[PDB]
Design a protein around this ligand. Structure first.
Ligand SMILES: Nc1ncnc2c1ncn2[C@@H]1O[C@H](COP(=O)(O)OP(=O)(O)OP(=O)(O)O)[C@@H](O)[C@@H]1O
Ligand SMILES: Nc1ncnc2c1ncn2[C@@H]1O[C@H](COP(=O)(O)OP(=O)(O)OP(=O)(O)O)[C@@H](O)[C@@H]1O
Ligand SMILES: OCCc1c[nH]c2ccccc12
Ligand SMILES: OCCc1c[nH]c2ccccc12
Lengths: 326, 326
């Protein structure tokens, strides 16, 4: 039985991009693999987070993990900061990675483009993520396309540690879905949808109500050609909407192209909004059930205890390999 | 009663520079302050350390801490990596510091000058050091001159956290001794003496035997003027040797200048070597007593338990202020 690890930042409320690219597949993989699913709050604070919003987004993410169908008896669900081994292993891997490898990361370059002043944690984001994965001898890392480069670096760091000190880490492999690996922003179809986008109109969170979802889908940027067909280069907006429609409804893109022959973008958008609303309706109902109850904290308590047992043992082996401590 | 924190890297065997600039004063301050003295093995691995040498240098440093007279019932002596709070607080402070502040650090610039490839841990050395200090509500940090800049940054990070989130950290002050704050290398009197210098002749470790100390002092670079007088600009070699002689023997520099009027560098160096040997002789005897015994590990066990109690509580307050966890 292979091991899976994957994490989601409580930098906001997760989007249909997070769902389609990652979380939706978590629900299937929990039955086939030994699964660790993490709320990576230490990654979230690599940029400014209001403390009250962060505390709440951590609970919201935990509730949405379970609301979409993750069974806490089949997968280990826990908060990153409640397992100290992640910070401990992050430091050791920070001493393995070179500054040039971190500065070349695409995520760092895009996230620091606003400039002014960028935290060191943003630069050292990858070694913490590498620690997340390597601590549990992870075989498979299910992610969207945006995390492929970080997993490539994680493999490099595992190989470097293994050959500098001794064989210890499993070399992880990314698992990126064939469909929906990069949901695009509704207001800029050339940028990926992000839950921390300064525009709320760029994303659909799993907690958006019907009126909000209708507004954001109908406001999504398109061309003016009027034909509903998939073509990323010429029609990136319509192409993104068709991809969301297809993967949420179960209709193929060609089937959707035929369905909307001779129809305008207006009815296409209105229909897609209702497809999204109906998808989110049972998720939101179970979400409110998890946010109301003490059982959410008990799930998190037990998840952290289990992750701590595995991760702290790996840290002991990492320290012994490097010569730290006694 | 004010609190003191100071740490020494097990990157090697500590030198007379480490002793004169820091450790010697530890022995006095332990009776006047609430003291934490640390073996910072996580700082040591910011550059390559052979695991076997690192494991041994950690024990050697612990033994030399106690051999010079640190009383484990008057001060808390512990290993950095055995208190996870240091890595945890280091991550949070990494999210407070800006990359530009780390790149401007003098230590980073000098240590990365060899170039090729520099670990990220070398860049993020300061936020871990800031964590070391701030975790124990430290008032005073006794160090040599080389650590002044790191403590200035630590104060900046404490103030930034305090005003971004809420008053939590004590603002520490450096305590740099009037005499001996920067012992210089014996082979390059314009560089500070360093325990990890690629030349062994640059430093005198506390464990150097008599023949070795004689060799290194007699090989120390001087001018050819022949006069024994203190003048850093014209005679940096002789000036460094006079400073070591003065602070170890209790004679003032002027008293030493008068004593060696009309004498050559040869007898001056030979005499200084014996002053150093006699200084180290009782230290080395008690060192061998600590390395032989189980009581060294018990001291370290109790030190880590006490430091963990204080540091883990501060991490809980740091997490609560930032919104991490629950
Ligand atoms: N636009 C996207 N399309 C598909 N998957 C995505 C997308 N964005 C994130 N993911 C996925 O969500 C998972 C968690 O990553 P993360 O927490 O950092 O999302 P985010 O960047 O903060 O939110 P988002 O990108 O949607 O705006 C990843 O496994 C994977 O990258
Ligand atoms: N040349 C020196 N003169 C005086 N104090 C020193 C000197 N070098 C280090 N120190 C002091 O030793 C303490 C521990 O610092 P550290 O472990 O990093 O020493 P080091 O750089 O590795 O060894 P060294 O500088 O002697 O070659 C510090 O509080 C303080 O900087
Ligand atoms: O950076 C993407 C979020 C994340 C943090 N740690 C991880 C480990 C595995 C998959 C995703 C993450
Ligand atoms: O960098 C100098 C060694 C060191 C690491 N952490 C510290 C905290 C206080 C004084 C010195 C150190």
């Amino acid at each position: 039985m292979k091991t899976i690890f994957s994490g989601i930042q409580p930098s906001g409320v997760i989007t249909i991009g997070n769902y389609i690219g990652a979380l939706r597949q978590f629900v299937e993989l929990q039955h086939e693999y030994n699964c660790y699913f993490c709320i990576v709050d230490q990654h979230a604070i690599t940029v400014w987070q209001d403390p009250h919003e962060l505390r709440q987004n951590i609970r919201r993410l935990a509730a949405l993990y379970l609301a979409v169908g993750i069974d806490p008896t089949q997968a280990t669900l826990f908060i990153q900061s409640e397992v100290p081994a992640h910070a401990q292993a992050a430091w050791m891997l920070q001493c393995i990675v070179y500054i040039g490898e971190l500065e070349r990361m695409t995520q760092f370059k895009e996230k620091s483009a606003g400039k002014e002043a960028v935290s060191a944690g943003l630069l050292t984001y990858p070694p913490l993520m590498a620690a997340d994965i390597l601590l549990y001898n992870t075989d498979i890392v299910p992610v969207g396309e945006d995390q492929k480069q970080h997993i490539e670096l994680t493999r490099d760091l595992a190989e470097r540690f293994n050959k500098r000190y001794g064989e210890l880490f499993t070399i992880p492999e990314a698992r990126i879905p064939k469909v929906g690996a990069r949901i695009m922003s509704l207001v800029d179809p050339t940028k990926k949808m992000s839950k921390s986008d300064p525009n709320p109109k760029a994303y659909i969170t799993l907690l958006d109500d019907a009126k909000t979802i209708e507004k954001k889908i109908k406001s999504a940027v398109t061309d003016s050609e009027g034909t509903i067909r998939y073509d990323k280069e010429a029609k990136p907006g319509i192409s993104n909407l068709l991809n969301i429609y297809s993967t949420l409804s179960g209709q193929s893109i060609e089937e959707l192209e035929r369905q909307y022959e001779g129809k305008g973008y207006g009815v296409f958008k209105a229909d897609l909004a209702q497809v999204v609303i109906e998808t989110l309706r049972p998720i939101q109902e179970r979400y409110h059930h998890w946010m109301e109850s003490e059982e959410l904290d008990r799930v998190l308590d037990e998840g952290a205890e289990k992750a701590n047992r595995v991760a702290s043992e790996m840290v002991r082996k990492m320290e012994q390999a490097m010569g730290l401590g006694r």
